[PDB]
Design an enzyme around this catalytic site. Sequence first.
Site, PDB file in Angstrom:
ATOM      1  CD  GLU A  24       5.087   1.695  -7.280  1.00 57.74           C
ATOM      2  OE1 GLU A  24       5.452   0.574  -8.357  1.00 57.74           O
ATOM      3  OE2 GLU A  24       5.760   1.770  -7.177  1.00 57.74           O
ATOM      4  CE1 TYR A  80      -4.329  -2.261   0.395  1.00 57.33           C
ATOM      5  CE2 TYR A  80      -2.445  -3.406   1.284  1.00 57.33           C
ATOM      6  CZ  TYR A  80      -3.462  -3.237   0.958  1.00 57.33           C
ATOM      7  OH  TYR A  80      -4.286  -4.443   0.899  1.00 57.33           O
ATOM      8  CB  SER A  81       0.845   4.095  -1.899  1.00 59.30           C
ATOM      9  OG  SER A  81       1.052   3.790  -3.244  1.00 59.30           O
ATOM     10  CE1 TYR A 138      -3.591   1.030  -6.864  1.00 65.87           C
ATOM     11  CE2 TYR A 138      -1.754   1.078  -6.609  1.00 65.87           C
ATOM     12  CZ  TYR A 138      -3.300   1.596  -6.589  1.00 65.87           C
ATOM     13  OH  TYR A 138      -3.009   3.205  -5.546  1.00 65.87           O
ATOM     14  CB  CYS A 157       0.713   6.487  -8.733  1.00 64.03           C
ATOM     15  SG  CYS A 157       0.258   5.062  -7.319  1.00 64.03           S
TER      16      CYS A 157
HETATM   17  C1  LIG Z   1       3.086  -1.061  -5.306  1.00 59.72           C
HETATM   18  C2  LIG Z   1       1.279  -1.359  -5.158  1.00 59.72           C
HETATM   19  C3  LIG Z   1       1.213  -0.384  -4.207  1.00 59.72           C
HETATM   20  C4  LIG Z   1      -0.594  -0.214  -4.020  1.00 59.72           C
HETATM   21  N1  LIG Z   1      -0.972   0.816  -3.494  1.00 59.72           N
HETATM   22  C5  LIG Z   1      -2.028   0.586  -2.917  1.00 59.72           C
HETATM   23  C6  LIG Z   1      -2.905   1.895  -2.420  1.00 59.72           C
HETATM   24  O1  LIG Z   1      -2.854   2.555  -1.858  1.00 59.72           O
HETATM   25  N2  LIG Z   1      -4.660   1.400  -1.938  1.00 59.72           N
HETATM   26  C7  LIG Z   1      -5.142   0.251  -1.788  1.00 59.72           C
HETATM   27  O2  LIG Z   1      -7.142   0.202  -1.340  1.00 59.72           O
HETATM   28  N3  LIG Z   1      -4.472  -0.769  -2.731  1.00 59.72           N
HETATM   29  C8  LIG Z   1      -3.197  -0.766  -3.223  1.00 59.72           C
HETATM   30  N4  LIG Z   1      -2.082  -1.952  -4.089  1.00 59.72           N
HETATM   31  C9  LIG Z   1      -3.252  -3.059  -3.797  1.00 59.72           C
HETATM   32  C10 LIG Z   1      -3.379  -3.863  -2.665  1.00 59.72           C
HETATM   33  O3  LIG Z   1      -1.895  -4.085  -2.751  1.00 59.72           O
HETATM   34  C11 LIG Z   1      -4.570  -5.254  -3.542  1.00 59.72           C
HETATM   35  O4  LIG Z   1      -4.058  -5.296  -4.746  1.00 59.72           O
HETATM   36  C12 LIG Z   1      -5.454  -4.224  -3.110  1.00 59.72           C
HETATM   37  O5  LIG Z   1      -5.832  -3.612  -1.323  1.00 59.72           O
HETATM   38  C13 LIG Z   1      -6.254  -6.253  -3.054  1.00 59.72           C
HETATM   39  O6  LIG Z   1      -5.941  -6.965  -1.709  1.00 59.72           O
HETATM   40  P1  LIG Z   1      -6.746  -7.704  -1.466  1.00 59.72           P
HETATM   41  O7  LIG Z   1      -5.801  -8.983  -0.232  1.00 59.72           O
HETATM   42  O8  LIG Z   1      -7.217  -6.923  -0.813  1.00 59.72           O
HETATM   43  O9  LIG Z   1      -7.070  -9.025  -2.293  1.00 59.72           O
HETATM   44  P2  LIG Z   1      -6.878 -10.362  -3.070  1.00 59.72           P
HETATM   45  O10 LIG Z   1      -7.504 -11.638  -1.080  1.00 59.72           O
HETATM   46  O11 LIG Z   1      -5.208 -10.582  -2.683  1.00 59.72           O
HETATM   47  O12 LIG Z   1      -8.226 -10.128  -3.821  1.00 59.72           O
HETATM   48  C14 LIG Z   1      -8.891 -10.982  -3.846  1.00 59.72           C
HETATM   49  C15 LIG Z   1      -8.841 -11.776  -5.803  1.00 59.72           C
HETATM   50  O13 LIG Z   1      -9.315 -11.252  -6.773  1.00 59.72           O
HETATM   51  C16 LIG Z   1      -8.171 -10.774  -6.949  1.00 59.72           C
HETATM   52  N5  LIG Z   1      -7.998  -9.636  -7.424  1.00 59.72           N
HETATM   53  C17 LIG Z   1      -6.455  -8.415  -6.235  1.00 59.72           C
HETATM   54  N6  LIG Z   1      -6.503  -7.168  -7.190  1.00 59.72           N
HETATM   55  C18 LIG Z   1      -7.749  -7.227  -7.633  1.00 59.72           C
HETATM   56  C19 LIG Z   1      -8.090  -6.108  -8.264  1.00 59.72           C
HETATM   57  N7  LIG Z   1      -7.522  -4.900  -8.265  1.00 59.72           N
HETATM   58  N8  LIG Z   1      -9.323  -6.386  -9.480  1.00 59.72           N
HETATM   59  C20 LIG Z   1      -9.885  -7.224  -9.019  1.00 59.72           C
HETATM   60  N9  LIG Z   1      -9.831  -8.207  -9.057  1.00 59.72           N
HETATM   61  C21 LIG Z   1      -8.196  -8.348  -7.988  1.00 59.72           C
HETATM   62  C22 LIG Z   1      -7.249 -11.507  -6.944  1.00 59.72           C
HETATM   63  O14 LIG Z   1      -5.994 -12.851  -8.476  1.00 59.72           O
HETATM   64  C23 LIG Z   1      -7.626 -12.635  -5.372  1.00 59.72           C
HETATM   65  O15 LIG Z   1      -7.588 -14.037  -6.340  1.00 59.72           O
HETATM   66  C24 LIG Z   1      -1.012  -1.824  -4.163  1.00 59.72           C
HETATM   67  C25 LIG Z   1      -0.236  -2.469  -4.942  1.00 59.72           C
HETATM   68  C26 LIG Z   1       0.747  -2.005  -5.748  1.00 59.72           C
HETATM   69  C27 LIG Z   1       1.673  -3.683  -6.065  1.00 59.72           C
END
Ligand SMILES: Cc1cc2nc3c(=O)[nH]c(=O)nc-3n(C[C@H](O)[C@H](O)[C@H](O)COP(=O)(O)OP(=O)(O)OC[C@H]3O[C@@H](n4cnc5c(N)ncnc54)[C@H](O)[C@@H]3O)c2cc1C
Length: 295
Positions: free
Chosen positions: A293, A76-77, A295, A253
Amino acid sequence: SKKQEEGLVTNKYKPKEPYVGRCLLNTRITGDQAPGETWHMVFSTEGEVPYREGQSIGVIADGEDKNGKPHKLRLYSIASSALGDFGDSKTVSLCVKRLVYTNDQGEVVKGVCSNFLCDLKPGAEVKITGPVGKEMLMPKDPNATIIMLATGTGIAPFRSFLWKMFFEEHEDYKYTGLAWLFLGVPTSDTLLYKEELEKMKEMAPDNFRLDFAVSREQTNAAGEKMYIQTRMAEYKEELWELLKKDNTYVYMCGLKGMEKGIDDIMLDLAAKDGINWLDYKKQLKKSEQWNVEVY
Ligand SMILES: Cc1cc2nc3c(=O)[nH]c(=O)nc-3n(C[C@H](O)[C@H](O)[C@H](O)COP(=O)(O)OP(=O)(O)OC[C@H]3O[C@@H](n4cnc5c(N)ncnc54)[C@H](O)[C@@H]3O)c2cc1C
């Protein structure tokens, strides 16, 4: 490097032994009519996590996966400047979108970490790793023109940037350049940090430009939906001119895919100027003036 890399710290804390902070505040920053929820949370760090503007932290949600192992970290940024929302250098803040959607099979998918974070109550502990990254570090040049392109939670690192630039006093860093933020969201109910941003605009009127792009509610003169690239197009001549200056740095971003629309308007601008945008972008990336950046 042209970025604030001095004394940079990465992964002081790892998944095997993360830092355990505590939620100090957790607030939903999206309206009640908003289709999705986004929360702004502040964690205590005791001044143990040496992060800086532009970096991320990993969060290890409580519980276990289907195999009994701890959940994999999610990045998370960081939405707070190095001094933090409380100005004491003892906290770190996140801007989290609750991930909840229904797949084509009618199965609801609740993101593990995002929901864990948004459900946090003050006093609750949180496993943190990092700091992470160096791609989004701020320019060293205090007179740099900083163009920030964000969609949704992508606003996070720029809130971090803007706090240091306009809400803080640093004898060693007195920002005098032009900061320009473009923030694209679907509805005005999801205009993250609207109040804060407009307050910055009020105290630094000539140094901060703020353009919101609400695709479902705004259109340009032609009636086209106001996506981030659509709003940018309202300033095409200015932007292109700035992209040719050596002290101009562009940061992007947010949601992957926001890149395409942005490239489309850049392709047009460069071409009219006899330039191939694809090549120019490669050069800007190499000269550290195009930082992404998504995602
Ligand atoms: C460099 C970087 C910076 C980030 N900054 C932020 C930030 O500031 N705020 C923020 O809210 N998030 C941010 N994210 C996204 C965060 O890291 C997670 O990917 C997001 O919050 C979802 O994670 P989760 O654990 O809730 O879901 P998960 O349990 O990981 O997801 C459930 C399922 O949904 C799928 N899935 C995952 N992401 C998505 C999506 N976006 N759309 C559709 N399907 C998806 C997966 O493949 C998984 O099987 C960032 C990611 C990166 C790589």
